[PDB]
Amino acid sequence: LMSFPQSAPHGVVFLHVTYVPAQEKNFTTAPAICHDGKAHFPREGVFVSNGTHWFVTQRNFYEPQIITTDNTFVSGNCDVVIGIVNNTVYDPLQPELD
Amino acid sequence: LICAQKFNGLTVLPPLLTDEMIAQYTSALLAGTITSGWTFGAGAALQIPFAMQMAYRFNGIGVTQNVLYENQKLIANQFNSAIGKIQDSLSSTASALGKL
C-alpha cells in the first residue's frame, strides 16, 4: 500500500504498510456459463457459488453480485470450453423495460 | 586433490543446508505455485484450479481469457513439447552450466 521512511544514524528505516487477506472460505468455481448456447465469461471477477445459485466477485474480497450482462461478455458457442455449467445469465433490460 | 588440499590445514566447512533439504524447498515452492497461483507469497495459500490461474496470467499480458479457454489443448501440447526439448538440451552435452 505505502511506506514511510524514518531516519537513523548511518542508515535509514522504512515502515512498509502491506495488505494481507485474512480468513477464507472454499467455494465451487467454474470457467463459464452459457445461457443460450453462447458462453459468458467474467469481465474481471470469477464465477462462484454458495452451492445453489451463482455469482461473480472480485478476486480478493468475497462480495457477490447477480450475473448481469454488464460484468460479463460473450465469445461464441458453448461447446468448445471445458467445465462450463448450464445456468441463466440474468439480464436487466427486460425487467426495466416495463 | 581433495586430501592434498586437506593436508595443510585447508578445510572445507560443509554447507549448512544439505542438497536434499534444498530440493525439498524447491518442491515446496513448485507445489505452491502450481496450486495456489501467486497468492501464497501474501499469506496462506489458496487452492484454485490451474486453468483459471493460467487465464488470469493471460489477462496479465492483455489477452482476454477466451483465447485460453478455447486453445487449452493446444497450449498443453506446446508446453509438453517444450519441456521435452528442455530435457534434451540439458541431457545433451550442450553445456549451459559454464556459469557454474
Short mmCIF file of all heavy atoms in Angstrom, two decimals, chain B residues 10-70:
data_model
loop_
_atom_site.label_atom_id
_atom_site.label_comp_id
_atom_site.label_asym_id
_atom_site.label_seq_id
_atom_site.Cartn_x
_atom_site.Cartn_y
_atom_site.Cartn_z
N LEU B 10 43.97 -26.45 5.33
CA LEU B 10 42.84 -26.09 4.48
C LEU B 10 41.73 -27.09 4.65
O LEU B 10 41.86 -28.26 4.28
CB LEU B 10 43.27 -26.05 3.02
CG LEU B 10 44.42 -25.14 2.63
CD1 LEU B 10 45.74 -25.87 2.74
CD2 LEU B 10 44.21 -24.65 1.22
N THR B 11 40.63 -26.64 5.23
CA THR B 11 39.46 -27.48 5.40
C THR B 11 38.35 -26.98 4.50
O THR B 11 38.49 -25.98 3.80
CB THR B 11 38.98 -27.50 6.84
OG1 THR B 11 37.69 -28.12 6.90
CG2 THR B 11 38.90 -26.10 7.39
N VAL B 12 37.23 -27.69 4.54
CA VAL B 12 36.04 -27.29 3.83
C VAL B 12 34.89 -27.42 4.82
O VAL B 12 34.33 -28.51 4.99
CB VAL B 12 35.79 -28.13 2.58
CG1 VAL B 12 34.51 -27.69 1.90
CG2 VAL B 12 36.96 -28.01 1.63
N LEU B 13 34.55 -26.33 5.48
CA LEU B 13 33.39 -26.36 6.35
C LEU B 13 32.16 -26.69 5.52
O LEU B 13 31.80 -25.93 4.62
CB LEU B 13 33.22 -25.02 7.05
CG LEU B 13 34.50 -24.35 7.55
CD1 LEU B 13 34.17 -23.13 8.39
CD2 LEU B 13 35.32 -25.33 8.36
N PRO B 14 31.51 -27.82 5.78
CA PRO B 14 30.43 -28.25 4.91
C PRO B 14 29.26 -27.29 4.99
O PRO B 14 29.12 -26.53 5.96
CB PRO B 14 30.06 -29.63 5.47
CG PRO B 14 30.45 -29.56 6.89
CD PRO B 14 31.66 -28.68 6.96
N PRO B 15 28.40 -27.27 3.98
CA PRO B 15 27.31 -26.30 3.96
C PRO B 15 26.36 -26.54 5.11
O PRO B 15 26.28 -27.64 5.66
CB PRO B 15 26.63 -26.54 2.62
CG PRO B 15 27.52 -27.46 1.87
CD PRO B 15 28.27 -28.23 2.88
N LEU B 16 25.62 -25.50 5.46
CA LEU B 16 24.60 -25.68 6.48
C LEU B 16 23.42 -26.45 5.96
O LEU B 16 22.90 -27.34 6.64
CB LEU B 16 24.13 -24.33 7.01
CG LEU B 16 23.02 -24.45 8.05
CD1 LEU B 16 23.47 -25.35 9.18
CD2 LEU B 16 22.67 -23.09 8.58
N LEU B 17 22.96 -26.13 4.75
CA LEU B 17 21.84 -26.83 4.15
C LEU B 17 22.35 -27.97 3.29
O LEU B 17 23.33 -27.81 2.56
CB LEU B 17 20.99 -25.87 3.34
CG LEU B 17 20.19 -24.95 4.25
CD1 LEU B 17 19.16 -24.18 3.47
CD2 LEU B 17 19.52 -25.76 5.33
N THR B 18 21.69 -29.11 3.39
CA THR B 18 22.03 -30.29 2.61
C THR B 18 21.14 -30.36 1.38
O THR B 18 19.94 -30.08 1.45
CB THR B 18 21.86 -31.56 3.43
OG1 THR B 18 20.47 -31.89 3.49
CG2 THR B 18 22.40 -31.36 4.82
N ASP B 19 21.74 -30.78 0.27
CA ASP B 19 21.06 -30.72 -1.02
C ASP B 19 19.68 -31.35 -0.98
O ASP B 19 18.78 -30.89 -1.68
CB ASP B 19 21.92 -31.39 -2.08
CG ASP B 19 23.23 -30.68 -2.27
OD1 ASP B 19 23.30 -29.48 -1.95
OD2 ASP B 19 24.19 -31.32 -2.74
N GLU B 20 19.49 -32.38 -0.17
CA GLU B 20 18.15 -32.94 -0.02
C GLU B 20 17.19 -31.89 0.52
O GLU B 20 16.07 -31.74 0.02
CB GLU B 20 18.19 -34.16 0.88
CG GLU B 20 16.86 -34.49 1.52
CD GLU B 20 15.79 -34.83 0.51
OE1 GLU B 20 16.14 -35.34 -0.58
OE2 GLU B 20 14.60 -34.59 0.80
N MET B 21 17.61 -31.16 1.55
CA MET B 21 16.76 -30.12 2.10
C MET B 21 16.41 -29.09 1.04
O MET B 21 15.24 -28.70 0.90
CB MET B 21 17.45 -29.44 3.28
CG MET B 21 17.81 -30.37 4.40
SD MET B 21 18.99 -29.60 5.51
CE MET B 21 19.31 -30.95 6.63
N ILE B 22 17.41 -28.62 0.30
CA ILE B 22 17.16 -27.60 -0.71
C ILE B 22 16.19 -28.12 -1.75
O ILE B 22 15.28 -27.41 -2.19
CB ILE B 22 18.48 -27.16 -1.36
CG1 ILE B 22 19.41 -26.60 -0.30
CG2 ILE B 22 18.23 -26.13 -2.41
CD1 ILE B 22 20.73 -26.17 -0.87
N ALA B 23 16.38 -29.37 -2.18
CA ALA B 23 15.45 -29.96 -3.12
C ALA B 23 14.04 -29.96 -2.56
O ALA B 23 13.08 -29.68 -3.29
CB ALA B 23 15.89 -31.38 -3.47
N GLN B 24 13.90 -30.25 -1.28
CA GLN B 24 12.57 -30.20 -0.68
C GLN B 24 12.01 -28.78 -0.72
O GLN B 24 10.82 -28.59 -0.99
CB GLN B 24 12.60 -30.74 0.74
CG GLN B 24 11.23 -30.83 1.34
CD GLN B 24 11.23 -31.56 2.66
OE1 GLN B 24 12.27 -32.02 3.13
NE2 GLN B 24 10.06 -31.67 3.26
N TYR B 25 12.85 -27.79 -0.45
CA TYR B 25 12.41 -26.40 -0.58
C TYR B 25 11.85 -26.13 -1.97
O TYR B 25 10.76 -25.58 -2.11
CB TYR B 25 13.56 -25.43 -0.31
CG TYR B 25 13.69 -24.98 1.11
CD1 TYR B 25 14.82 -24.31 1.54
CD2 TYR B 25 12.67 -25.17 2.02
CE1 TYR B 25 14.95 -23.89 2.83
CE2 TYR B 25 12.78 -24.75 3.32
CZ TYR B 25 13.93 -24.10 3.72
OH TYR B 25 14.06 -23.67 5.01
N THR B 26 12.62 -26.47 -3.00
CA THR B 26 12.16 -26.19 -4.35
C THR B 26 10.87 -26.94 -4.65
O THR B 26 10.00 -26.42 -5.35
CB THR B 26 13.22 -26.56 -5.37
OG1 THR B 26 13.26 -27.98 -5.51
CG2 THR B 26 14.56 -26.05 -4.92
N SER B 27 10.73 -28.16 -4.13
CA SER B 27 9.48 -28.88 -4.32
C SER B 27 8.33 -28.12 -3.69
O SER B 27 7.24 -28.01 -4.27
CB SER B 27 9.58 -30.27 -3.71
OG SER B 27 9.65 -30.16 -2.31
N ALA B 28 8.54 -27.60 -2.49
CA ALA B 28 7.51 -26.83 -1.82
C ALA B 28 7.12 -25.63 -2.67
O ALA B 28 5.93 -25.37 -2.89
CB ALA B 28 7.99 -26.38 -0.45
N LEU B 29 8.11 -24.87 -3.13
CA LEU B 29 7.83 -23.70 -3.96
C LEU B 29 7.04 -24.10 -5.19
O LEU B 29 6.08 -23.42 -5.58
CB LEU B 29 9.12 -23.01 -4.36
CG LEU B 29 9.73 -22.11 -3.31
CD1 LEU B 29 10.97 -21.46 -3.84
CD2 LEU B 29 8.72 -21.07 -2.93
N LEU B 30 7.43 -25.19 -5.83
CA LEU B 30 6.80 -25.59 -7.07
C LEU B 30 5.34 -25.97 -6.84
O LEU B 30 4.46 -25.60 -7.62
CB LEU B 30 7.57 -26.74 -7.69
CG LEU B 30 7.03 -27.20 -9.03
CD1 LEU B 30 7.09 -26.05 -9.99
CD2 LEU B 30 7.87 -28.35 -9.53
N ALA B 31 5.08 -26.71 -5.76
CA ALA B 31 3.69 -27.06 -5.46
C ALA B 31 2.89 -25.82 -5.12
O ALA B 31 1.74 -25.68 -5.56
CB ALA B 31 3.64 -28.07 -4.32
N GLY B 32 3.47 -24.92 -4.34
CA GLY B 32 2.78 -23.69 -4.01
C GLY B 32 2.38 -22.93 -5.25
O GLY B 32 1.24 -22.47 -5.36
N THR B 33 3.30 -22.79 -6.20
CA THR B 33 2.95 -22.12 -7.45
C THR B 33 1.85 -22.86 -8.18
O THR B 33 0.79 -22.29 -8.45
CB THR B 33 4.17 -22.00 -8.35
OG1 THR B 33 5.03 -20.98 -7.84
CG2 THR B 33 3.74 -21.62 -9.73
N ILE B 34 2.06 -24.14 -8.49
CA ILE B 34 1.11 -24.83 -9.35
C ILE B 34 -0.23 -25.11 -8.68
O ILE B 34 -1.12 -25.66 -9.33
CB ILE B 34 1.67 -26.17 -9.83
CG1 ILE B 34 1.84 -27.11 -8.65
CG2 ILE B 34 2.99 -25.96 -10.50
CD1 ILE B 34 2.40 -28.44 -9.03
N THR B 35 -0.40 -24.77 -7.41
CA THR B 35 -1.70 -24.96 -6.79
C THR B 35 -2.35 -23.69 -6.28
O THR B 35 -3.58 -23.62 -6.24
CB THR B 35 -1.59 -25.94 -5.62
OG1 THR B 35 -0.72 -25.39 -4.63
CG2 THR B 35 -1.04 -27.25 -6.10
N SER B 36 -1.58 -22.68 -5.89
CA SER B 36 -2.17 -21.52 -5.25
C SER B 36 -2.02 -20.25 -6.07
O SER B 36 -2.15 -19.15 -5.51
CB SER B 36 -1.57 -21.30 -3.87
OG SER B 36 -2.16 -20.18 -3.23
N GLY B 37 -1.75 -20.35 -7.36
CA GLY B 37 -1.49 -19.14 -8.13
C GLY B 37 -0.31 -18.40 -7.54
O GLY B 37 0.73 -18.98 -7.24
N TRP B 38 -0.48 -17.09 -7.37
CA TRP B 38 0.56 -16.25 -6.80
C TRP B 38 0.23 -15.82 -5.38
O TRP B 38 0.95 -14.99 -4.81
CB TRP B 38 0.75 -15.02 -7.67
CG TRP B 38 -0.49 -14.24 -7.79
CD1 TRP B 38 -0.98 -13.35 -6.89
CD2 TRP B 38 -1.42 -14.28 -8.87
NE1 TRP B 38 -2.17 -12.83 -7.34
CE2 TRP B 38 -2.45 -13.38 -8.56
CE3 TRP B 38 -1.47 -14.97 -10.07
CZ2 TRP B 38 -3.53 -13.17 -9.40
CZ3 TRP B 38 -2.54 -14.76 -10.91
CH2 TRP B 38 -3.56 -13.87 -10.57
N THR B 39 -0.84 -16.35 -4.80
CA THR B 39 -1.31 -15.84 -3.52
C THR B 39 -0.31 -16.10 -2.40
O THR B 39 0.02 -15.19 -1.64
CB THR B 39 -2.65 -16.46 -3.17
OG1 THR B 39 -2.43 -17.82 -2.75
CG2 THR B 39 -3.56 -16.45 -4.37
N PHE B 40 0.17 -17.34 -2.30
CA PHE B 40 0.84 -17.77 -1.07
C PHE B 40 2.02 -16.89 -0.71
O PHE B 40 2.47 -16.90 0.44
CB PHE B 40 1.27 -19.22 -1.19
CG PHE B 40 2.41 -19.43 -2.12
CD1 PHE B 40 3.71 -19.30 -1.69
CD2 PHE B 40 2.18 -19.78 -3.43
CE1 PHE B 40 4.75 -19.50 -2.55
CE2 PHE B 40 3.22 -19.98 -4.29
CZ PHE B 40 4.50 -19.85 -3.85
N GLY B 41 2.55 -16.13 -1.67
CA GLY B 41 3.53 -15.13 -1.31
C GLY B 41 2.98 -13.99 -0.47
O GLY B 41 3.75 -13.13 -0.04
N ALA B 42 1.67 -13.98 -0.23
CA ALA B 42 1.00 -12.93 0.51
C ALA B 42 0.06 -13.53 1.54
O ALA B 42 -1.11 -13.17 1.64
CB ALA B 42 0.24 -12.00 -0.43
N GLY B 43 0.56 -14.49 2.31
CA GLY B 43 -0.26 -15.10 3.33
C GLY B 43 -0.43 -16.58 3.12
O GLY B 43 0.50 -17.27 2.71
N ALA B 44 -1.63 -17.09 3.39
CA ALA B 44 -1.90 -18.51 3.26
C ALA B 44 -2.24 -18.84 1.82
O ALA B 44 -2.93 -18.08 1.14
CB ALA B 44 -3.04 -18.93 4.18
N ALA B 45 -1.76 -19.99 1.36
CA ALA B 45 -2.06 -20.43 0.00
C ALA B 45 -3.56 -20.64 -0.17
O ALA B 45 -4.26 -20.98 0.79
CB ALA B 45 -1.31 -21.72 -0.30
N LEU B 46 -4.04 -20.46 -1.39
CA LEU B 46 -5.45 -20.64 -1.71
C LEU B 46 -5.55 -21.56 -2.91
O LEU B 46 -5.07 -21.22 -3.99
CB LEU B 46 -6.12 -19.30 -2.02
CG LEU B 46 -5.73 -18.15 -1.11
CD1 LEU B 46 -6.36 -16.87 -1.61
CD2 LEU B 46 -6.16 -18.43 0.31
N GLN B 47 -6.18 -22.72 -2.73
CA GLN B 47 -6.31 -23.61 -3.86
C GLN B 47 -7.18 -22.96 -4.92
O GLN B 47 -8.11 -22.21 -4.63
CB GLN B 47 -6.91 -24.95 -3.44
CG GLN B 47 -8.41 -24.97 -3.42
CD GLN B 47 -8.96 -24.29 -2.20
OE1 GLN B 47 -8.26 -23.57 -1.50
NE2 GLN B 47 -10.24 -24.52 -1.94
N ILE B 48 -6.84 -23.24 -6.18
CA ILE B 48 -7.55 -22.63 -7.30
C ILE B 48 -7.24 -23.44 -8.54
O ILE B 48 -6.07 -23.75 -8.81
CB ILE B 48 -7.16 -21.16 -7.45
CG1 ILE B 48 -7.95 -20.51 -8.58
CG2 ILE B 48 -5.68 -21.01 -7.66
CD1 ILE B 48 -7.99 -19.01 -8.47
N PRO B 49 -8.24 -23.85 -9.31
CA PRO B 49 -7.99 -24.74 -10.44
C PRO B 49 -6.97 -24.13 -11.39
O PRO B 49 -6.95 -22.92 -11.59
CB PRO B 49 -9.36 -24.88 -11.09
CG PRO B 49 -10.31 -24.62 -9.99
CD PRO B 49 -9.67 -23.56 -9.15
N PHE B 50 -6.13 -24.98 -11.95
CA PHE B 50 -4.99 -24.47 -12.71
C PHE B 50 -5.44 -23.61 -13.88
O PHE B 50 -5.02 -22.46 -13.99
CB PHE B 50 -4.13 -25.61 -13.22
CG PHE B 50 -2.79 -25.17 -13.66
CD1 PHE B 50 -2.08 -24.26 -12.91
CD2 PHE B 50 -2.23 -25.64 -14.82
CE1 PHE B 50 -0.84 -23.85 -13.31
CE2 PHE B 50 -1.00 -25.22 -15.22
CZ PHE B 50 -0.30 -24.33 -14.46
N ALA B 51 -6.29 -24.15 -14.75
CA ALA B 51 -6.70 -23.43 -15.94
C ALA B 51 -7.13 -22.01 -15.62
O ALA B 51 -6.78 -21.07 -16.35
CB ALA B 51 -7.84 -24.18 -16.63
N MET B 52 -7.88 -21.83 -14.54
CA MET B 52 -8.32 -20.48 -14.21
C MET B 52 -7.13 -19.60 -13.86
O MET B 52 -7.08 -18.43 -14.27
CB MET B 52 -9.32 -20.53 -13.07
CG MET B 52 -10.45 -21.48 -13.34
SD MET B 52 -11.80 -21.23 -12.21
CE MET B 52 -12.18 -19.55 -12.64
N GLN B 53 -6.16 -20.14 -13.14
CA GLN B 53 -4.99 -19.34 -12.82
C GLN B 53 -4.22 -18.98 -14.08
O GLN B 53 -3.71 -17.86 -14.22
CB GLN B 53 -4.11 -20.10 -11.84
CG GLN B 53 -2.80 -19.44 -11.61
CD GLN B 53 -1.72 -20.44 -11.41
OE1 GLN B 53 -2.00 -21.62 -11.23
NE2 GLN B 53 -0.48 -20.00 -11.44
N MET B 54 -4.14 -19.91 -15.03
CA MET B 54 -3.50 -19.60 -16.29
C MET B 54 -4.21 -18.46 -16.99
O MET B 54 -3.57 -17.51 -17.44
CB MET B 54 -3.45 -20.83 -17.17
CG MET B 54 -2.51 -20.66 -18.32
SD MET B 54 -1.03 -19.81 -17.80
CE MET B 54 -0.01 -21.20 -17.36
N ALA B 55 -5.54 -18.54 -17.09
CA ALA B 55 -6.29 -17.48 -17.74
C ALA B 55 -6.04 -16.14 -17.06
O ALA B 55 -5.96 -15.10 -17.72
CB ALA B 55 -7.78 -17.80 -17.73
N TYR B 56 -5.90 -16.16 -15.74
CA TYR B 56 -5.54 -14.93 -15.05
C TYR B 56 -4.20 -14.41 -15.51
O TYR B 56 -4.05 -13.22 -15.81
CB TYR B 56 -5.54 -15.15 -13.55
CG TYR B 56 -6.93 -15.23 -13.01
CD1 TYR B 56 -7.19 -15.79 -11.78
CD2 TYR B 56 -7.99 -14.74 -13.75
CE1 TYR B 56 -8.47 -15.86 -11.30
CE2 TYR B 56 -9.26 -14.80 -13.29
CZ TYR B 56 -9.50 -15.36 -12.06
OH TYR B 56 -10.78 -15.42 -11.59
N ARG B 57 -3.21 -15.29 -15.58
CA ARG B 57 -1.91 -14.83 -16.04
C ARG B 57 -1.98 -14.31 -17.47
O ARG B 57 -1.22 -13.40 -17.83
CB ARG B 57 -0.88 -15.94 -15.90
CG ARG B 57 -0.44 -16.12 -14.48
CD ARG B 57 0.21 -17.45 -14.29
NE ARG B 57 0.58 -17.68 -12.90
CZ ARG B 57 1.76 -17.36 -12.39
NH1 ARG B 57 2.67 -16.80 -13.15
NH2 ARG B 57 2.01 -17.60 -11.11
N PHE B 58 -2.89 -14.84 -18.28
CA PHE B 58 -3.07 -14.29 -19.62
C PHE B 58 -3.63 -12.88 -19.58
O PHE B 58 -3.10 -11.98 -20.25
CB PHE B 58 -3.95 -15.19 -20.48
CG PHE B 58 -3.19 -16.20 -21.27
CD1 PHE B 58 -3.85 -17.16 -22.00
CD2 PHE B 58 -1.83 -16.14 -21.34
CE1 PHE B 58 -3.16 -18.06 -22.74
CE2 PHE B 58 -1.13 -17.05 -22.08
CZ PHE B 58 -1.80 -18.01 -22.78
N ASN B 59 -4.71 -12.67 -18.83
CA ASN B 59 -5.17 -11.29 -18.66
C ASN B 59 -4.06 -10.40 -18.17
O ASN B 59 -4.06 -9.19 -18.42
CB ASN B 59 -6.35 -11.20 -17.70
CG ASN B 59 -7.65 -11.56 -18.36
OD1 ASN B 59 -7.86 -11.26 -19.53
ND2 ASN B 59 -8.55 -12.16 -17.60
N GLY B 60 -3.09 -10.98 -17.46
CA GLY B 60 -1.90 -10.24 -17.09
C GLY B 60 -1.22 -9.54 -18.25
O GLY B 60 -0.74 -8.42 -18.08
N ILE B 61 -1.20 -10.15 -19.43
CA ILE B 61 -0.46 -9.57 -20.54
C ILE B 61 -1.44 -9.13 -21.62
O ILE B 61 -1.13 -9.18 -22.81
CB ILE B 61 0.58 -10.54 -21.09
CG1 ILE B 61 -0.07 -11.79 -21.65
CG2 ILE B 61 1.54 -10.94 -20.02
CD1 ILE B 61 0.89 -12.64 -22.40
N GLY B 62 -2.63 -8.72 -21.20
CA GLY B 62 -3.58 -8.13 -22.12
C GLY B 62 -4.04 -9.08 -23.20
O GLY B 62 -3.95 -8.79 -24.39
N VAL B 63 -4.50 -10.26 -22.78
CA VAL B 63 -5.05 -11.23 -23.70
C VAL B 63 -6.28 -11.82 -23.04
O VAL B 63 -6.18 -12.54 -22.04
CB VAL B 63 -4.04 -12.33 -24.04
CG1 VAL B 63 -4.48 -13.06 -25.26
CG2 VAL B 63 -2.67 -11.75 -24.25
N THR B 64 -7.46 -11.52 -23.58
CA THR B 64 -8.70 -11.91 -22.93
C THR B 64 -8.86 -13.42 -22.87
O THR B 64 -8.42 -14.15 -23.75
CB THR B 64 -9.89 -11.28 -23.64
OG1 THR B 64 -11.10 -11.78 -23.06
CG2 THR B 64 -9.84 -11.57 -25.12
N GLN B 65 -9.53 -13.87 -21.81
CA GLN B 65 -9.46 -15.27 -21.39
C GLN B 65 -9.88 -16.23 -22.49
O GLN B 65 -9.35 -17.35 -22.58
CB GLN B 65 -10.36 -15.47 -20.18
CG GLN B 65 -9.97 -14.60 -19.01
CD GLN B 65 -10.91 -14.77 -17.84
OE1 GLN B 65 -11.87 -15.53 -17.90
NE2 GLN B 65 -10.64 -14.03 -16.77
N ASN B 66 -10.85 -15.84 -23.32
CA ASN B 66 -11.44 -16.79 -24.25
C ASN B 66 -10.39 -17.44 -25.12
O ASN B 66 -10.55 -18.60 -25.53
CB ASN B 66 -12.48 -16.08 -25.10
CG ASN B 66 -12.04 -14.73 -25.48
OD1 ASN B 66 -10.89 -14.37 -25.21
ND2 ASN B 66 -12.92 -13.94 -26.07
N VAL B 67 -9.29 -16.75 -25.38
CA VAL B 67 -8.22 -17.38 -26.16
C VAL B 67 -7.71 -18.61 -25.44
O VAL B 67 -7.54 -19.68 -26.03
CB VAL B 67 -7.11 -16.36 -26.46
CG1 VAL B 67 -6.34 -16.02 -25.21
CG2 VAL B 67 -6.18 -16.89 -27.53
N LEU B 68 -7.51 -18.50 -24.13
CA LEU B 68 -7.06 -19.66 -23.38
C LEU B 68 -8.14 -20.71 -23.30
O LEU B 68 -7.92 -21.89 -23.59
CB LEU B 68 -6.62 -19.25 -21.98
CG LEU B 68 -6.11 -20.50 -21.28
CD1 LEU B 68 -4.95 -21.06 -22.05
CD2 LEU B 68 -5.70 -20.17 -19.89
N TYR B 69 -9.33 -20.31 -22.91
CA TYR B 69 -10.34 -21.35 -22.77
C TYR B 69 -10.77 -21.92 -24.07
O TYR B 69 -11.65 -22.78 -24.06
CB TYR B 69 -11.55 -20.82 -22.02
CG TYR B 69 -11.32 -20.73 -20.54
CD1 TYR B 69 -11.96 -19.78 -19.77
CD2 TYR B 69 -10.45 -21.60 -19.92
CE1 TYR B 69 -11.75 -19.71 -18.42
CE2 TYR B 69 -10.23 -21.53 -18.57
CZ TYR B 69 -10.88 -20.58 -17.82
OH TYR B 69 -10.66 -20.51 -16.47
N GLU B 70 -10.24 -21.47 -25.20
CA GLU B 70 -10.50 -22.13 -26.46
C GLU B 70 -9.28 -22.80 -27.06
O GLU B 70 -9.43 -23.57 -28.00
CB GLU B 70 -11.08 -21.13 -27.47
CG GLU B 70 -12.48 -20.67 -27.10
CD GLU B 70 -12.95 -19.50 -27.93
OE1 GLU B 70 -12.17 -18.54 -28.12
OE2 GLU B 70 -14.10 -19.53 -28.40
#
